[PDB]
Every structure is written in C-alpha cells, then in structure tokens.
Amino acid sequence: GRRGDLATIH
Amino acid sequence: RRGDLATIH
Amino acid sequence: FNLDVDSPAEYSGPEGSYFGFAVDFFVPSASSRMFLLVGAPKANTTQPGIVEGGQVLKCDWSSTRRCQPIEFDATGNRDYAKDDPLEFKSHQWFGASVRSKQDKILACAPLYHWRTEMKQEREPVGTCFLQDGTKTVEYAPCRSQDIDADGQGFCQGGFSIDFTKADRVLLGGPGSFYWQGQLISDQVAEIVSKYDPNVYSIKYNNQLATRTAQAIFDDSYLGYSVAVGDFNGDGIDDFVSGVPRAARTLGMVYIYDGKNMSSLYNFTGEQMAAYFGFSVAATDINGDDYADVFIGAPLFMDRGSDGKLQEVGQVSVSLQRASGDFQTTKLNGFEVFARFGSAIAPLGDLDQDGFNDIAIAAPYGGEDKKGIVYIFNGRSTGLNAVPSQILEGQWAARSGCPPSFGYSMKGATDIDKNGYPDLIVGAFGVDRAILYRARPVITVNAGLEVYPSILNQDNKTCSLPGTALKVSCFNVRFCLKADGKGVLPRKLNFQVELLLDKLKQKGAIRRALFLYSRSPSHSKNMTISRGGLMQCEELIAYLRDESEFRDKLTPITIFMEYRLDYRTAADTTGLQPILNQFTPANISRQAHILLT
Amino acid sequence: FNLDVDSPAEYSGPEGSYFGFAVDFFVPSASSRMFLLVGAPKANTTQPGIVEGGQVLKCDWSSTRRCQPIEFDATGNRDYAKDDPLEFKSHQWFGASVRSKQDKILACAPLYHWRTEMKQEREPVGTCFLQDGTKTVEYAPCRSQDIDADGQGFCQGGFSIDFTKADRVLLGGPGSFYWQGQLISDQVAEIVSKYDPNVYSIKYNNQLATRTAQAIFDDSYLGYSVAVGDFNGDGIDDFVSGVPRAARTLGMVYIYDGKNMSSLYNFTGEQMAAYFGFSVAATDINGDDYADVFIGAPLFMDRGSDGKLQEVGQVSVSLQRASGDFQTTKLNGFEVFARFGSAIAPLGDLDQDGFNDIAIAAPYGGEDKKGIVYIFNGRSTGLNAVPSQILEGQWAARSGCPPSFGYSMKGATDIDKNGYPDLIVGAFGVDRAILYRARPVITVNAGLEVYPSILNQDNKTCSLPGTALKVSCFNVRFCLKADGKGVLPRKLNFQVELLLDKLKQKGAIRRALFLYSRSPSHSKNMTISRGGLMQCEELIAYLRDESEFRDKLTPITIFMEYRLDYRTAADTTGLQPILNQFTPANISRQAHILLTGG
Amino acid sequence: NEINTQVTPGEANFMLKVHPLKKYPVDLYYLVDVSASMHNNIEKLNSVGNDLSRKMAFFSRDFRLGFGSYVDKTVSPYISIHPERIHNQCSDYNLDCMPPHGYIHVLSLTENITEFEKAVHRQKISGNIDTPEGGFDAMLQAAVCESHIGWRKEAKRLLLVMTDQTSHLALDSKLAGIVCPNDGNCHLKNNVYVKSTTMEHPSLGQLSEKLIDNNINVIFAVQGKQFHWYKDLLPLLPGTIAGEIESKAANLNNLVVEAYQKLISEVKVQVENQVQGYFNITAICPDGSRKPGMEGCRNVSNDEVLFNVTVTMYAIIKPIGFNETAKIHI
Amino acid sequence: INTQVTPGNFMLKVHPVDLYYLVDVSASMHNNIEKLNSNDLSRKMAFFSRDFRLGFGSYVDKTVSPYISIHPERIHNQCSDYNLDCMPPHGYIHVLSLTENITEFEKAVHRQKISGNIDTPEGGFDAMLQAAVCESHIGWRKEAKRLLLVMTDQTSHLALDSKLAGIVCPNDGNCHLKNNVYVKSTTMEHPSLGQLSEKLIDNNINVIFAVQGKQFHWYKDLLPLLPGTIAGEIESKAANLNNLVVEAYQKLISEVKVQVENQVQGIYFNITAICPDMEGCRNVSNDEVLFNVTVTMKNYIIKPIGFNAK
Ligand SMILES: *[C@@H]1O[C@H](CO)[C@@H](O[C@@H]2O[C@H](CO)[C@@H](O[C@@H]3O[C@H](CO[C@H]4O[C@H](CO[C@H]5O[C@H](CO)[C@@H](O)[C@H](O)[C@@H]5O)[C@@H](O)[C@H](O[C@H]5O[C@H](CO)[C@@H](O)[C@H](O)[C@@H]5O)[C@@H]4O)[C@@H](O)[C@H](O[C@H]4O[C@H](CO)[C@@H](O)[C@H](O)[C@@H]4O)[C@@H]3O)[C@H](O)[C@H]2NC(C)=O)[C@H](O)[C@H]1NC(C)=O
Ligand SMILES: *[C@@H]1O[C@H](CO)[C@@H](O[C@@H]2O[C@H](CO)[C@@H](O[C@@H]3O[C@H](CO)[C@@H](O)[C@H](O[C@H]4O[C@H](CO)[C@@H](O)[C@H](O)[C@@H]4O)[C@@H]3O)[C@H](O)[C@H]2NC(C)=O)[C@H](O)[C@H]1NC(C)=O
Ligand SMILES: *[C@@H]1O[C@H](CO)[C@@H](O)[C@H](O)[C@H]1NC(C)=O
Ligand SMILES: *[C@@H]1O[C@H](CO)[C@@H](O)[C@H](O)[C@H]1NC(C)=O
Ligand SMILES: *[C@@H]1O[C@H](CO)[C@@H](O)[C@H](O)[C@H]1NC(C)=O
Ligand SMILES: [Ca+2]
Ligand SMILES: [Ca+2]
Ligand SMILES: [Ca+2]
Ligand SMILES: [Ca+2]
Ligand SMILES: [Ca+2]
Ligand SMILES: [Ca+2]
Ligand SMILES: [Ca+2]
Ligand SMILES: [Ca+2]
Ligand SMILES: [Ca+2]
Ligand SMILES: [Ca+2]
Ligand SMILES: [Mg+2]
Ligand SMILES: [Mg+2]
C-alpha cells in the first residue's frame, strides 16, 4: 500500500 | 493413425 | 545383515491368483494398527459375471497370519445402454499395483477395458480406485475423449503408481499415443471432490500430464515405472519414470518437475535391449539429503572374464550432486539369467547406522531358480557395493511359472514398532509373501589388558592358594561395553572365554595357568547394561615352575572370545538382537618370558 | 609489509568525476594480458543529451598508465512513445559499483531512473550492464511491473554487487519495499539468454530473491553491501549482505544460502548508529579452509581512556567453525573521525607465508584527512590485530570533498606476474587510483655461537697478529642462510654488524675486542647464494689484560644484526625485495668471565 | 583314440585348428514377418525360390529350404480385442487378412523347390496394432523344434529372418500381463506355437544360447531404416549377419548368397563351462596377424586356420555355428 | 577571581534561557503542528528561568532523490496526489531568530505550513547541527543555558544514509546559511552522532527531544551517546508540550556530568564521581557536588555538561 511519511494522510 | 496398419491406410 | 531369517511371517493367497505380485504396508494412523497389502491380479471374485477381476488383500501382522480382501468395487460391468456394455472388468489385473500412503490406498487394474462413449470399441485405458477410510472412489484419467491408440485409448493407466510428499498421485501409462507413454499427476483432494459414478470421463482442475510428441518416440513405454524425489531443491517431489524402449531400445529415465511437468533430467542406458528402466527408485543413500536415483537393467549382459557375454543384469547408482548433475556408479549382477534388477526397494535405515539402505532382487537366481534378494547398505561415500545379506527363495515352482521370489518388495516401514525398518517380499509364482523383520543391532566394545607383559621366572611374588609355594604372577584384565538403538533389553549377557598360551595344542604343555583354578581356560557370564558404564573383571595368572617346561621363546598369547546369550536377549516375540556387522569374534594380547 | 610504496603506479581521470569510486582487476583469459578497472560515477559522456551519465574505464598495466572508457551503452534516453521518455540516464551514477570475473564485467548505476510502462513517474530502480567478449546486455532485475515504493520502484539495484564461484551474480538494492532492501541473484547464463532489447522488464527462470516482509522492517537497507563465501559446506557460495539500519539501527548482516536463498546466520551490531554493515568481506584468514566474515562499522565510537566517547570505527572478525559457529573478535580504529572500517579488501597471501591477509581503510584519517589504509596479516590463531603496514594519502583536499583515500580498493590478483598479490586503492575525492605492487619476501635463518662461553683470564692461548703477546681468546661464529618466493636473483648482499660487550656504554670501558681489529665492533659484507646451505664466518675475539678493568660480573653480550642491500636485489622493474618482518633482524648471545674456583 | 571331427583335434599352450570344408550342404529356413507393413514384400517372396536354386547351385552342394511365418502375440494390447477384428485385424480397411498368430510352421525343410514355391504363393497377410513384431518368439521355436522342421545333421543351418520393423523384447510382455520367463523348449502342438500367449518373449541372451547350441547361423533380411537396428545388435549375437533389403525388392537372392559367402569366411571361436575357475585365447589368421579369440578371421577359402589357446587357473570349445564341438577336460 | 564553577584524592565542585523550537514539518506531523499553535509556556516558565526567549525553525529532509519524489508535479509539492496545500520540502529553514517578543513566535507558528516527503526517517540531525553552530543567525545568548527542542514523531536519518542519494562528502560542521536557509542540505551528508555531540558540546547546547509515537524509545536509547541531552514522549492526546519542556528543563539542570579534553601527549584522567548520597547525579538547586580525579605523567580543559575551567 502506502507507508512512510505520506501514510497517515490517506 | 500409425503402427502396423499405417501403410495400408 | 540384520534381517531375521530364522522365523519370518509367511502369507499365502489363492492358488494361481498371483498373490504377491505387488506388496506394500498400510499404516492408517487413525487406527494405531499396521497391516500388509498384497495384490492378487488373477484372483477370482464375487463381482457378478466377472472372471479374474483381481483383489487386494489386507494381511494383518498381529496375531495369526490371516488376510482379508478389501471391498473397493462390488459391482460388475456397468452399461452405457441396454445391451451395450460400458466396462469389461474381466481379466483386468486389479491389484497389479498397490501403493499406500497413510489411511489412503490406491490400487489399479492396468488391463481394464471400456467401450468409449463414441464407438463400440474395447480399449485398455486402465483404471484405478482410491479408498480413504469410509469413502472410496474411481480414478481413470485415461478414460477420456482422447480415444484410440492415437490418444489414451491404450494408455493402461496404473501400470505404475506412486504417492508424493504433498498429497499428489503420480500415475504412469506406457500405452498412450501409440505407446509413447505418459505420466499423469492429480491432486488427491480433487480425485475425491470431483468423483461421480455416472460420469465416465472426469475432469480434474490441477492435472499435470505429458504431451503427445513426434512419431519417432513411438514404442517408448514412458510410465513403465515411477518413483518420486526432489531434484531441483523446491521441496516439492518431482516425477521420475523409466522409459525402457526409448532411444532405439537403449532405455532412458525422464525426470519432470513436480510442479508443472517440465523435463528436468535425462538418463540413458549404454546397451541395447538391456531394458534399462524396468525398475526405478529414489532415496537419499549417503545422508546428504539429496535423493539419489537407482535404475535397473535386468537384461544387461557383461563381457565376462572369458571374453564371452552373459546376461546377469545391471543396476546403476546415481548420487545427486549439490551442483545439480549426478555422480553415477554401476553395479552388475552375479548369476546368469537371474534378471538381477527386476525390483529395487528402498529400505530406510535398516541398521539405524545413519545411512539409508536398499534391497535389490534377482527373481530367477539361486538354487533351482527360486529367487534371491540382495541387501546393500549405504555409506557416506555412496552405496557399499558388497551385499551384507542374501535372502534365498524357499519354494519350488508349483507349475508353469517360476516362484519369482523378489519380483516385488516393499520396505522402510517399522511394522513391529521396534525402531528398525522391515521388508515385505512377494513371490507371485507360488502365491506367497514374506515379512522379514529387522533385528536390533548391538555395538560392543571389548577390552583386554595384560600387565606386566615381560614375565620374570625368578620373580615369585603371589602365593599359589593350597600350597606353600610361590609363583610368578601377572594380571589379566578384560572389559566389556555394549549399547544399541531402539527397543532393547536393559541388560545384556555375554559369555567370555579366555585361554592362556593359545599357540600350544593338545599334548604340548600349557605354560601359564589361572591362579585360582590351575587351568588354562576361564569362563565367566558377564552382565552389563546397555548404554551404561563398562564392566571389567580382574584376574591373576602364573607360570609353571622352571623345571616343568623348556620352551621359553614362543610368545604366550592370551586369546579371548565373547559370545552373546541371544535367546535371553530376545524380545516378547522371540526376535533376538544381532551383534554389529564388523565385530571381532576374538581379541588377543601377548606376554613373553624373560630370558637371562 | 611488503607493498612497494616507493614507486606506485598512479592513474588519473577527468576532474570532478569521482574517478576511483570503485576499482577492480580484469584478467580476461584466452591471452596473457591483464588490466585494471576504475569507476567514474559522475563522468560526462558522449551519450546523446545526457549529463554525468557515469562511465567505467579500463586502465592498462603495460608500461604507460593510460585509461580508455568502456562503451557499455552509447545510446541515450529511449522513448516509451512519442515524446514520452522511458529512461533517465542523467546523473545515474554509472560506475558507482564495479566487479569483474575473468571475461565478464559488471558495472551498475544505482541512481538510474525510469518511467514505468504504467504511468509517468521517475523511479530509481537502478540498472546494470554486463559485457562478455563482444556481447553486452542490460540487467535491471528491479525494473519490473512491481512499481512504486511499496514495490521495487526505488530499489536502486546494483548499489552493491559480486560474482560467485559458479557464475551467479549477487545484487543489492536497499530501496525495495520502502527501504527494507532486497537481494537478487541470477545465473549469468540466463542474463544473456533471456536478454531482449524491446522488453524492459525481463523475467528469468532460475532467479533467487528475498521477498517483501512486514512494515517493521522498513528502512533496513538490505543489500547496502554484499560479499560471498561458503558457510554450510555445500561448496555453493552463499550470500552475505549488510543491513546497516536494521534492528533499531543496531545494524545487521544477513547470510542467505546460495542455493535456495534461505536464511542461515544473522549478525547484530552492538552500538546504535554505528552503521554495522556499511562494508562486508569474506575470506579464509587462518588457513582453516573456511571463509571468515569481516564486518565494518565506520561510525562506532568507543569509550576511550578518559571515559569519554569518540568516533573511531570498528571492524568485527568472525571465524567460521566446523560446527557452524563463529568465533568473533573485534577491532577498533585509531584516529578519530577517520571512519575506520569503511572499506575491507581481501588480499590473498600478500606475503606468501601460508595465510591470507586483508586491508582495512580509514578514508578520512592521517595528515590533513588525506586518508589511510591498514594492512593486517593472518595467522593460524586468527587475524594479527597489529597492522604491518600503513598507506598514507598523498593528495590534499581539492575543492570541498576530502580526498577519500581508501574509500574503495581491491586486491587478491598478481598483475605483474611476480608471485605476490597486488593492491588497488582509490581516492574519488581527487579522481585518482593507485596500484601498489607486492615486493618479494626474503626469509633469513641466522645463527650465532660463542665458544668457549666461560672465559678464563689466565688461559692465554692465541697471540696477537704480528706481536708475541698472548691473550685469552674465544671464537665468535655467525651464520647466514636465506631464500624466498618469487622473482629474485641467485645471490644476496647482506651487511652484518657485530658488537662485543654491548651492555657497556660510551664512557664505560669495553672488555672484549676482536683479535685483528682491537675494537668492539666488526662489520662484514657477506654474500650468500639463495637457497644455499648455511654460510658461516669464524672470528677470534680476546679479552683485555686482567689489570685494565675492574668489572668481572656484568655479562659480556654479543649482538649481531644483518641488513639487506635492497637497491641491488631489484627485478626488471625496480621492485626491491624486503626482509621477512616476522623474524628479528638481530640476535644476541653472551659469555662471562670466570672467577676464582679450585 | 580316433580323431573323428572337422576340427583339429577332436578332443598349457596347445594349438587348435578347423578344416574349412569346401562346398557345404545347406539348410535354409525362410522365417518371414507377415504383418500388414510387409504387404508389399510377400508379393516379392513368391518367385525367389526357383532362382535361389539357380544362384545357390554354384556355392551349395545340394540344399533345401523351408518356410514359416510370424506376426505377434495374439493378446491385448498387441491386437484388437474387438470381435470383428480379433480374427481379422483389417476390418476397418476390409482387406482379405488372415488371422494373427505368434508362429506357424507350414513347410518343413524340403529339397523339392516347387514345394517352397507352393507354400509361399499360398501365403496370406496378417495384421496387428503396435509397430514392433514378435519375431524372437518364432526364431527360438524354429531353433529348438528340430523334429518338426527337420534341420539336417550335417548342414550349415541358415535361418533368414525377413522383417521391416523392430522386434518385441522379453519384458515387453508385462503390458499383456505375461510375466513368466520363456523356457526355451519346443511348443508346437500341431505345427503351431501355443505358448505365445503364456510365456513372455525370449531375451537376447536366451536366444543366443539356443542358437549356438544348435549350430544355427542367422541372416537378417530387413528393409526400412530399421536395418541399422539389427546391424547394431550383431555385437550381442555371435553367428548372425544383417543385410539391407533394397526397397525396390528382388534383393533376397543377392543377400542370401552374399551373406552366405561372408558367413563361411567368418571363423570365430567361443568357450563353455570351466573347473570353477581364464582361457586366454589368441587367434591367428592365415596372414600374420594377432587377432583376439572372438575376433575370428575373415577372407579365409579352403585354407588352414590357427589360434593358440592358453589354459590356466568338463569344458567345450565350439567353432561359431559349426557342426563340430572339440571338448576338453581333465 | 571567579566564574560559576569552583575553581576556575583531589576533588572539584560546581556552583537566562534561550529555547529554539526545531520542529519536524513532515507530512506525518500534520496533527501535531495544529496543537503547537498555542503563551502558556511563559506562564509556567517565568518563575524558574529568570527571564527567557524563544526562537523557531523547521526541517523535513534532504530535497533529493530518493528521499523525495523528483516528479515535477510533486518535486515542489510532495502532496500532489492529494492536492493538499503543502509547502515545498527543505532540509532546514530558519524563520525566527531568538527573540524576546513572544507574540512573534506565536505568529510564526500559526503561519507555518506542512511539507511532505517519502521515506519515514527525517533529516533532523542536519537541522540540529546548523542550529548549534550558526550563532549569528539564531543569536544564542552568551551566558544563558542554550536549549534546543527538537519536535518529531519518527526516527532520524544517519550520516551514511546519504550514500543512496549519491552524497558521499562528510559534513564539515560549519554554518552554511546564505539567506537563513541551509544550502548544503544536498551536498553534505548527515552528521554522525560524534560530530553532532561534539558540536553540541562545543556550543554548550542541551537538546530536548519532543517525540510522540513508539519511536520515542529510539531517542531514549541514544541519550547515552549525547551527553547533555534529554528525551520526552509527547502524549498522543497532545497539548502536553508545556509540561514536558518544564519537566525536561528541571531534570536537565539536575544532571551534572563532567568531561575532559586534550592531554599532554599521554595522561590518565581516572575520574571517580561521588554523589551527595556515570559522572552526573540527578534528584540533587545550589547544592554540593564532588568528583575525584586521578592524575599521572607519561600542554593545554574540563567541560561541564553543557554549562557556560582549564
Ligand atoms: C536449502 O538447501 C540446503 C542445502 O544446501 C538445505 O539444508 C539442508 O537441510 C536438510 C534438512 O533441512 C539437511 O538434511 C539432513 O541432513 C542430515 C545430515 O546432515 C549432516 O550431514 C550432511 C552430510 O554432508 C557430509 O557429507 C557430504 C558428502 O561427503 C559433504 O558434502 C559434507 O561436507 C559432509 O561431509 C552435512 O552436509 C550437513 O551439514 C549441515 O548441518 C551441519 C550440522 O550438523 C551444519 O554445521 C552445516 O553447516 C550444514 O548446515 C549435516 O552436518 C541427515 O542425517 C538428515 O536425515 C534425517 O532426516 C531425513 C529427513 O530430512 C530422513 O530422511 C533421514 O532418515 C534422517 O532422519 C537430513 O537428510 C541437509 O543436511 C542440509 N544441507 C545443508 C548443506 O545444510 C536447506 O534446508 C534448504 N532450505 C529450504 C528452505 O529448502
Ligand atoms: C682456552 O681458550 C682456548 C680458546 O681461546 C680454548 O680452545 C678452544 O676451545 C673451544 C671450546 O670453547 C674449542 O671449540 C670446539 O672445537 C671443536 C673442534 O676441535 C668442536 O668440535 C667443538 O664442538 C662444537 O662447538 C660449537 C658449539 O660450541 C658448534 O658450533 C660446533 O659445530 C661443534 O659442534 C667446539 O666448537 C676450540 O676448538 C678450542 N681451540 C683450540 C685451538 O684448542 C681452550 O679450550 C681454553 N682452555 C681452557 C682451559 O680454558
Ligand atoms: C661491502 O663491503 C666491501 C668490503 O670488501 C666494500 O668494498 C663494499 O664497498 C661494501 N658495499 C657496500 C654497499 O657497503
Ligand atoms: C632487535 O630487533 C627487535 C625486533 O624483534 C627490535 O625490537 C629491537 O629494538 C632490536 N634491537 C636492536 C638493538 O636493534
Ligand atoms: C602359443 O601361443 C603363444 C601366444 O603368445 C605363442 O607365442 C606360441 O608360439 C604358441 N605356441 C607355439 C607352439 O607356437
Ligand atoms: Ca522438485
Ligand atoms: Ca544423496
Ligand atoms: Ca543403514
Ligand atoms: Ca522392525
Ligand atoms: Ca553454501
Ligand atoms: Ca577461516
Ligand atoms: Ca599472509
Ligand atoms: Ca604482484
Ligand atoms: Ca506388433
Ligand atoms: Ca524522510
Ligand atoms: Mg509390421
Ligand atoms: Mg514524517
């Protein structure tokens, strides 16, 4: 999926 | 169809 | 070397039924019992109007040696329509191949014929049945719409069969595609999930099968025999099969990936008409964890010592290298026309010595051609080419056919739960099957010390009991230690037999005698515990007076031999342990007289 | 200790191109020729409209020191469609990693970006190029349909690389799977068989690779460094890779099996942020026949002598045991901020003594931070922890970036074909690479005897030369025998120095002199044939008269020392032999005055 | 006392010889495959006799010729078990095919050439399925059945095998459920091989031994590319020779005479039995040449032979296919 | 004849605040900035600091591949896929030098926007170093306990992480602000803890780590490697900054370690700390201390933990 710095946003 | 009867198929 | 021949369990079937043509163990694990499976291809049954349909009997090991037939199919020939028989189960040789994995049994009738759904024909597609405890089903993958010799019509599916590590079947059919042969592998989970007794050509989702190829491969016999083993390091068992007529009759062996049926490796025989590929087997023989391949060539003839040919048969051993290619040795036969290599049965670790073993049969060798089996043990370096044990067939030919002792055999199952794999041997020619049990192996370390070893006649120290005399004494100490694997008694009993000055014969005066007996021999029944500490017994000997013998040069040798009390070491069933193969029957030490 | 620092071969490249960022040897075979290899990651190329596309040059050993680039790919940025760039070869850092095995050469570009066939993106999947004779193929195992960061989009394949004993490639890509990193290995026979220029994401049958794992492993950098060696006795080389940011940044080093990529052993650093795993190497360092693992931690700081912390670095040394275990010993740096342990180069037997040796670099140490390299020799017990040689950087900072002498290096190849492994060192900070040649080693067996040793003053036997006086004499016999491996002449010139009564000082009186000089000292220019039998010279010494000195108790020591005339034992290229530093170049005996008695 | 053989002598480095008698009397047996694939070759076998005697008079000293046919085992899966085709394997092509059979003996060795001419003209064609044909089964029966065929005592026994395809092997029979090895005896109840459905084919070892024990030399008359198959098997069968029938036919007479010439020029030697333990033979030619024992000597006609045999640590020494066995014992 | 340390088994003893808010403005911090907005700091802190000031700066990460997306649409706005009002990424930006006017800090924060990048770890040590060495731009008061509060929720990039981006030149540890902006963020690699610690000590700067998630334990396990620094976990329910900074300051002053520097080309400094009850001592205001030093022979400092004696 989308992890990292932009993960919380989504 | 091959084998012994082939020449005839 | 440790297979019990004194009292084997002999099983017998109906006469002329070829009882023993195919053998295997049955260990259901949902019953905590164990049985033998024996195939009877030409046995008569109760099936309505059928002749020699064949049976498979479940022979019980515990208590008497009595067999019962398994009920797979009690129906006769089905009908496709009124007076249009679909099946021809007569003379189908059911039970010609048996192969059991856990509670799952798979028998096959390679000569089953059927009508086909398009034509009033009679073709040998072969069929199999699969029982799993309470449910039994049919499995005929060659009974399909690919009819006639051009297809699977003559496939004879079930000629050879085997299970894999991951619940899959491997079935061979040497007749597919004008006898090119074929291999078929279906998940057992689907052979049961898709079965339907009103459907004759059943579709299987995850089926793997070889594909028809060029006509040059006609008359190849792929699927004549099958074995299983990993040969590419994927964990999944791969498919191994003999192709005895392939390559202008030089014979071949194909290996296919067990995951998509793509060719992996090719073996090829060296001699024409040797029938290289009649038998095959796959097992790790050198403790590396790489399945090694064994291939039989019963009809191989070797240029004998006299420059003349002689048909003895030949097996080829092939060790799987980590690189990925094989290290191959060859092993010939012994007696002429004995068909050495008709059967090859992995045995597991027959002596639990760390390396798996293997048996190899010569069905038509020995005294009066009654069949022999050859037990070969494996080593770290390969297969020890010297057989450690020979099993000789003990039945004269009833009539017509030789006993064929060893034509089929199965092993690697410890049926008596004693920690040692046992062996089943069949001799269909006399309708017999034997269960050979593996005896426990005791490893014994024996010790013997002699001190001092240079004896001084004038050194009279010990006092000889019973007389005021003094004599020159020296000590004789012997020790003993024993251990073994598996089911063994807690204590073993050895009968030690020491003799002094053995280099002298009756008449010649014995120079050294035991202090407390004044005799040259000494007998003791020593009792040590398996896996316990060693047990020693110290003795004392002395020499005769200077004026009683003249020879002082000949060494005084001290000879020891130690038997085992086999009868008492036997277990509840009378199966008595055996001393390890290379154990000395005697160990000797030496002492000398001291001159001047 | 035998690396020739006098006349090293020096190679230069275009300014600012980081020439020397990566180095290696190249012995193509089919001919008696050898060359070097050097990487220039930021080098400007003729490729159409590409800036600093990187380049790898081939520097020759024969006479001149001239290098020529290797045209791996003269094309530009291919187009997936009209005006739709498929690749981005600008600033791709081609040549950041180099690696050679006989005829095959493998260079990579960790910062090569591509578009993806599915969307207009710029993803640094990294690509590599492989040349063999006249064939050249591209190899981008991370250039796949598995895109974006959660896939192989940022894998930067080729970051680190290495060959194997059986021609398998091993490739690191620390960006895969949100910087969990990845390892990939492919049969060289497949990289060429399955190559297709019109296909951008090639699939190879016999490929081994690590798979994505849980998110906790994010930011581990698996594949940051790589080495190879057998660690299960199968004969197949296994894969060793550093994972610097692993285990909460303690760092780790994974070992996978080379046949099925199944985990074998883990190493775990012991200090956070020490970057345990920046470098790794494998080689049998103690003649046991089992590869030994060396792991670098350039940022480790040890509690010094004053209970204070200071960044020095640390290498860990592990010896493979027959049981499978590892006997691990550590080794800290010497200078602060020198980044000791940045590079670790196996050398083979640099001195041909029976055990392999290893170089370890501290690229930011020495005078003015010009860089340093340390040579360590191996023994049956392990690695000798005291370095036998130190290589000092010669170039001062050019502009901004330090010289970085030792950041890369490669050894284990005898390029001048003299018999001893040579060494390459690179300093990208000044665009330089150096080839240090291994000098042959002479081993000397020296012997010294003094008879009689209990000297009797009243035993006056010999007479002084010419005169009729008589003195208490005694013999001093020194012996010399030597040989060596490699290119040497058949006769060596030594320089022997004997001294009598060494304990006595200048002002103190000397009690024993030489018969034919009447002096404590005696020089000799001896000349032995190489590998001959012991050659000895017998001297006659004597004592001063009984009434010339008072001390009869202090021993009389007899010291020998032998030097070797290096300038004359040179070979066809001026490479001078050196004395085996293992043995002491001096030996001492003793005799004493006899006192009273009966 | 006497020396009543054709080999010198009749009963350590002792030499041995043989007498290459010129103008032997010959007994030929035409054992022809009558499978469907041979449909074109039988029609060519008709008028071979009369000319055979014409060409054979020059080399033979009076001779005879018999005739028998073979197809395959009359069981599944070698034939069709369909009621309409079990007896006529050509039902789909409605041709006048006779029933299949393992082996049939129609004409014992007869010197009346017209008798052979009649027995062949009267011959029909059979058919089956699988390409390989069961020829070895018939060859064995023709060798051991001495009273039915009538092999002459003093006659270099020739057996011309005529086929166009490879042969079934011993263990091929497992497909048919036939697992009892061949016993190598004569099984002709009424000039018909009855055991063809109960005993498996004979192996090459079994075939070779029975051929030698009866002093029978074989001639393989093969046509298609499968000629090379029988050619590559002559190493495993001493006393046999092969010849490629020209696909244009009319080559039987030229092969049998050409094959006979080479057969008489061939003079190998073999051993038999022992005293529970080398017989390092070394054959020598008319021309100074060191020829291995089994090597024989070619281009020999009525000239001397030789070959000193060494014996070291009841036995028989047989010349290849000769009517004379010089035995030796201590 | 004095300073604030006495003097200026031989033992020794000892006898205005500037805070700098260095906040991570990465995308993961979107929820914490909104809580950083709000004045009370001075309310609780006025009695103990005896007058104080505070600055403000922000950091994200290095503005190069592969740490950010180099795609034109998001290279300047790393939130293009979510069309969010994100400001451009940056290594470190200085917006407010140390100022005593509290309202300026409140305004500079409220005006702050959010950035974004890719990889979870953020380049914080890069900003911390510049904040320590750049004295003329921040204006660290001479005689004042210099504090640097770093606010983040994730682990930090290390020195050799820069090799991925092709950055291989070590950090030089100088001040590089041409117009109050860190320009070398794309040319020099991150500083090591040793380089960071030494430059932190050389400027007598104590660090306060304001962290939130599970990554708090990460910074906790690093305080041994950074003398003079302290860590504190922000409650995920937020609005706990004021209680943490005061608790961090209290514990920071109770810590009294000692360190050495230079030597006479060979000396032992076998210090042996004794508490009133690791060289420091907590839970000790103007109370006694004592440290025993041992000295030997085989020539120019003793540095207190972040304090203002040769
Ligand atoms: C990926 O592939 C690797 C293979 O490279 C595989 O690792 C194997 O794992 C299997 C089981 O998981 C192991 O199989 C077992 O081996 C037992 C004996 O192994 C010992 O002896 C081996 C013999 O080698 C000797 O001889 C050869 C030839 O002379 C020579 O090459 C060797 O140097 C040596 O002299 C030896 O190789 C092996 O070494 C491993 O183990 C030791 C620890 O003892 C370790 O120190 C080594 O570093 C190395 O890892 C070992 O010493 C054997 O007894 C055992 O048999 C029992 O179980 C089987 C069922 O599996 C039964 O059938 C049998 O009756 C016994 O009950 C079993 O065969 C194999 O040894 C490993 N091989 C290696 C090289 O490690 C991984 O599992 C693969 N991974 C995946 C995910 O598939
Ligand atoms: C008075 O002093 C004189 C000398 O000033 C002394 O005469 C010498 O004594 C030495 C003993 O210290 C003799 O050395 C020996 O020589 C013989 C050959 O004759 C060797 O075989 C001897 O054996 C070994 O010597 C070496 C080790 O010491 C070995 O390297 C060597 O290979 C031999 O194995 C030994 O070398 C020397 O020969 C005499 N010389 C003469 C001319 O006599 C005398 O003995 C002293 N007397 C007293 C009373 O002090
Ligand atoms: C070595 O010694 C000899 C003494 O014979 C002298 O002539 C020569 O110059 C010396 N050489 C050197 C290099 O010292
Ligand atoms: C002798 O050699 C040793 C090296 O083993 C060295 O340490 C020592 O200083 C040398 N002594 C003299 C007097 O040169
Ligand atoms: C016997 O054979 C040997 C073969 O080596 C030969 O040398 C010898 O001459 C032969 N015997 C006679 C009598 O010639
Ligand atoms: Ca497999
Ligand atoms: Ca194996
Ligand atoms: Ca075993
Ligand atoms: Ca058992
Ligand atoms: Ca390995
Ligand atoms: Ca080692
Ligand atoms: Ca060395
Ligand atoms: Ca060299
Ligand atoms: Ca046929
Ligand atoms: Ca980041
Ligand atoms: Mg035919
Ligand atoms: Mg963030």
Residue numbers in the entry:
A (entry chain E): 213 to 222
B (entry chain F): 214 to 222
C (entry chain C): 1 to 596
D (entry chain A): 1 to 598
E (entry chain D): 70 to 80, 91 to 356, 358 to 380, 382 to 394, 405 to 421
F (entry chain B): 72 to 79, 92 to 98, 104 to 126, 129 to 367, 374 to 380, 382 to 395, 404 to 405, 407 to 414, ...
Give the authors' words.
Integrins comprise a family of αβ heterodimers with diverse functions in cell adhesion, migration, and signaling. However, two integrins, αVβ6 and αVβ8, appear to have evolved primarily to activate transforming growth factor-β1 (TGF-β1) and TGF-β3 and bind with high affinity to a RGDLXX(L/I) motif in the TGF-β prodomain. In contrast, the β8-subunit of integrin αVβ8 has a divergent cytoplasmic domain that binds to the Band 4.1 family. Furthermore, in contrast to other integrins, binding of ligand to αVβ8 fails to induce swing-out of the hybrid domain; that is, the open headpiece conformation.
An integrin αVβ8 headpiece fragment with high mannose N-glycans was expressed in GnTI-deficient HEK293 cells, purified, crystallized, and soaked with or without the TGF-β1 ligand peptide G213RRGDLATIHG223. The R215GDLATI221 sequence motif in the TGF-β1 peptide binds to αVβ8. The ligand Arg-215 sidechain hydrogen bonds to the αV Asp-218 sidechain. The ligand Asp-217 sidechain coordinates the MIDAS Mg2+. Compared to unliganded β8, specificity-determining loop 1 (SDL1) at the beginning of the α1-helix with its MIDAS-coordinating residues moves toward the Mg2+. This movement enables coordination of Ser-116, that is, the β-MIDAS S5 residue, to the MIDAS Mg2+ and a hydrogen bond of the Asp-217 sidechain to the SDL1 backbone. The ligand LATI sequence has an α-helix-like conformation with its hydrophobic Leu-218 and Ile-221 in a pocket formed by the β8 SDL2 loop. Contact with hydrophobic ligand residues Leu-218 and Ile-221 contributes to SDL2 ordering, including of residue Tyr-172. In response to binding soaked-in TGF-β1 peptide, in αVβ8 the β-MIDAS D/N8 equivalent Asn-119 residue moves 1.8 Å and the β-MIDAS S5 Ser-116 residue moves 1.4 Å. Soaking ligand into αVβ8 crystals induces movement toward the ligand of the S5 and N8 residues and the α1-helix in which they locate to positions that are intermediate between closed and open.
